[PDB]
Design a protein around this ligand. Sequence first.
Ligand SMILES: [Cl-]
Lengths: 149, 149, 8, 8
Amino acid sequence: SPGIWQLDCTHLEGKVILVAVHVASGYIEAEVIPAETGQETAYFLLKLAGRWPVKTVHTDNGSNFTSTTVKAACWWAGIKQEDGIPYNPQSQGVIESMNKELKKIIGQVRDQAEHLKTAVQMAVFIHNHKRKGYSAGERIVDIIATDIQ
Amino acid sequence: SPGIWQLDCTHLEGKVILVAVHVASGYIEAEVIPAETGQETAYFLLKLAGRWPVKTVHTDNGSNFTSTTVKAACWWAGIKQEDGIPYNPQSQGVIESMNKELKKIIGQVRDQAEHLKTAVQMAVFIHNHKRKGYSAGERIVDIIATDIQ
Amino acid sequence: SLKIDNMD
Amino acid sequence: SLKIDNMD
Ligand SMILES: [Cl-]
């Protein structure tokens, strides 16, 4: 539970937004890259696992599941690399609605930012602070601290 | 104190490593940029505040304290922007020893990474996971979760 | 440019 | 390149 994350890749403005969702809390981290490659996905996972205690990552597609560079980064960081098959069918829907909400927020802030990557971080900030009553930022800290004790 | 962070900028390989330290735990987040500008520092703080509940940032020098772009990002993200004058003298020393330690770890991993930014994220990972007994990653979660409750 | 990431 | 961020 506390250590499980899911990768998610969505497109906007001709660029790719790569998202990691902590499944139990709905807390997210994201970045903008020009296209999804194993090398970019690997670097993103190394950033995420230095910041939170990542035990398991459900990868977002078969290419990042197979990628030797992603497997090397998951080895380096002590992550179990898993598939992201929605065995629970409600998963496709939760991810899709999240992508839609993130794009809505990005459009709401987009004119406050010169670069898309700034708008995506503003959307990350709004998503993680929103309450509905705890926010996802509160929930992930509660969950992890409970696990440490 | 759960919400207080300090910025720190150090140099390696002709590039700049910008670090944010959560003062109470010693947990860090860092990035590599070609040089320290207000715009880069502002984007870095926006990333940080979407990920942790940042109340106060002690800026690393007077240029980033004065920067309109840094003040804009701190306004946007609800951060109180403060100076980083070491009122407690022991601060200079703790930051310096941290930079020395991070550079040491970077050199220990540098040949495992093509890019410096990968080695810096491997150093962030090793710093935040090291126990000496709780790690900094544990301490920051415990401190914030205690605040939330 | 009066953007949060570039106030020029 | 047999690096963690670029195994080619
Ligand atoms: Cl500089």
